[PDB]
Design a protein around this ligand. Sequence first.
Ligand code: ATP
Ligand code: ZN
Ligand code: ZN
Lengths: 57, 474, 222
Amino acid sequence: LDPSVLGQGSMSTRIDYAGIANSSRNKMKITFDGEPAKLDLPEGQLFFGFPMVLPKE
Amino acid sequence: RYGPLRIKELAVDEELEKEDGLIPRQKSKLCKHGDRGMCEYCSPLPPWDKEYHEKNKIKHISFHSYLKKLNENANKKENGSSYISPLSEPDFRINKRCHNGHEPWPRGICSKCQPSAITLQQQEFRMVDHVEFQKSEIINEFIQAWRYTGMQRFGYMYGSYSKYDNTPLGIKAVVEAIYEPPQHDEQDGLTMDVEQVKNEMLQIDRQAQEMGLSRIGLIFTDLSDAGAGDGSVFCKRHKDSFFLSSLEVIMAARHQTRHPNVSKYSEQGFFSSKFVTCVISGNLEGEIDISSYQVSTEAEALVTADMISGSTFPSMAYINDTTDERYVPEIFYMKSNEYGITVKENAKPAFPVDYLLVTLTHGFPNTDTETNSKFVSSTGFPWSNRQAMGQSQDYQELKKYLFNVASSGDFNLLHEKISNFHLLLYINSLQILSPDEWKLLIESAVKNEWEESLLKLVSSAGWQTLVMILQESG
Amino acid sequence: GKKRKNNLRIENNMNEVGYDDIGGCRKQMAQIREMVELPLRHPQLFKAIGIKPPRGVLMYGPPGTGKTLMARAVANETGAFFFLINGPEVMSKMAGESESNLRKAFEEAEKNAPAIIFIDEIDSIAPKRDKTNGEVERRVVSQLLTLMDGMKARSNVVVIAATNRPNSIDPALRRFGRFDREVDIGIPDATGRLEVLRIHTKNMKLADDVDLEALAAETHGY
Ligand SMILES: Nc1ncnc2c1ncn2[C@@H]1O[C@H](COP(=O)(O)OP(=O)(O)OP(=O)(O)O)[C@@H](O)[C@H]1O
Ligand SMILES: [Zn+2]
Ligand SMILES: [Zn+2]
């Protein structure tokens, strides 16, 4: 029902955000439960592919 | 007695420095004294009074007032010092040349040249207090880019600074036009070659300065329309989640470091660039509201020595290691708990970026027609490098836009067609007009007195050749 | 007319206290007037002779003797700007704000010269070293010392302080360029007590059988 770009779109299949998250886990569902892992992107790139959390409501 | 150094700073800074900013108070009912005199409740309120700000719902103290507070606290007159400079930007890089009896850092180090532990803490002042867009079209076109293409966008905003009376000794950046560099926007993000961007922006800045503008910030869109029938966007950024992700905070810090704010009260001569960053994401109700931010002076001094990187968690920024070049001490971020006690927590793995931000307030000029804008434009001739869409500047577009007015007269109509920022840049790039012709063109298009200059231009040989070739071209 | 003026006196909190509301302290009153009014009212005398008028004027005595009354009367009579500082009031504020109030007092008094800064109950903000417990009392004492020392040479500003005993104040406050001149107030004699009784028992609806002289004679140590 939601657009696929909400977690997996362009620049998420290029930069394996899912891969980074799961490899940090074992150190596919993505959640902010756990710990962060370094995600270093080159100067001049902005990433907006983080999973949406919506307002508290 | 030595004092502030001799260095030229913006007119706004000077005129702010001239003022005192004191807030007078009337006789309180708790005063015990006659008409002449004043005890503690009637004395003028300093411009930096925290109670006044928190009572008026102001979250920061208008940097010039912070400088006033520092000057009042320190630097006694006529004795007690030789004018210790009050402002000094943080610097965390290790002292590569200590030689206190030991070789440089890689193979020896003492307690004197060892960076001390860094304590992050929310900044209490903001350089620029307001950001004002002269017209709605400036951002309407910027968002029309996304509406038509579906990808994100990114562009620098040109303008100038001025006073802001709604806050004690406050500054507002007024933005006149937006320039979009060549960038490859994408569904979830955007990319842009740094070298091309800076090489183009050098000449763009030269031309803008010739026109009187300046580069004062960057703006990007973060929009993802919801599935509802109407035009609405998800509220991705809000209180509990991130406002600015780590990557954009880092980029903003770099931009601020590259645009230093020349100041007369610091040893280096600069302090905390007046560079703002705006983002278009959408408010809690599902609109296209816009928000403006600015990274603190310690984040600005943290990114320079690397020491930070983006993290897979949007709200938290990672920390690098103690390699053989960059030496990172222990970083603590200070917070106050619900019981009104400050608590220091070590954050080596990752810490929230909310301690590296200060929030500004945007707005638009009141509906009252002041017409202090430099351009009646932003709706017409296509903008900068939007070759992805059908917006491709070329001679045909000129022949269709700026030829009927030049073939009839109506000097007012010609003036309102000639006052387009991007049109001026394009005709400059055409290089048909000689430098003096272009100087008189810009002063005809931007100055409130343009009749004589417009007549001289239209009568000029260069303009005549330009219009003749434009007519001949099809 | 009078008091820098029914409207001429021939609300207003603790105001209208003049020289006619003080009785039995004419020697101390003369000393205070000489120390305060002359430097402010007629600065040309000291420039002509070529001296610097005194800045600090300490004043002490037993409680109830009228130190605050005398200071307020002088301030109101001189017709010159003045700035009340109350020791307990300054010391009842969060850390780092007592010094702010002291600095504001001195700077604002300097702005509107001529001025009189009346530091009432100075023994509570600059107490004796042994009882300066903590780093807040020491900090406020140091701030007061800084302001007192660095004031100026040309500014027409006078500082008046009231306390109970000479030994209740930090010794560092009684040096050159500080509270150097000091005045002592003692219990009044019979004539002084008679004058005080006359002052207070004026609005009262006294009966004809009153012997205020007898009360003055009977009240010793009052
Ligand atoms: N000649 C006088 N000497 C003393 N007190 C007088 C005199 N005439 C009137 N009074 C009254 O006596 C009381 C004196 O109290 P006051 O606060 O002046 O004394 P204080 O203990 O020196 O002051 P403070 O504690 O505020 O420094 C007041 O009611 C004042 O009105
Ligand atoms: Zn008052
Ligand atoms: Zn060393």
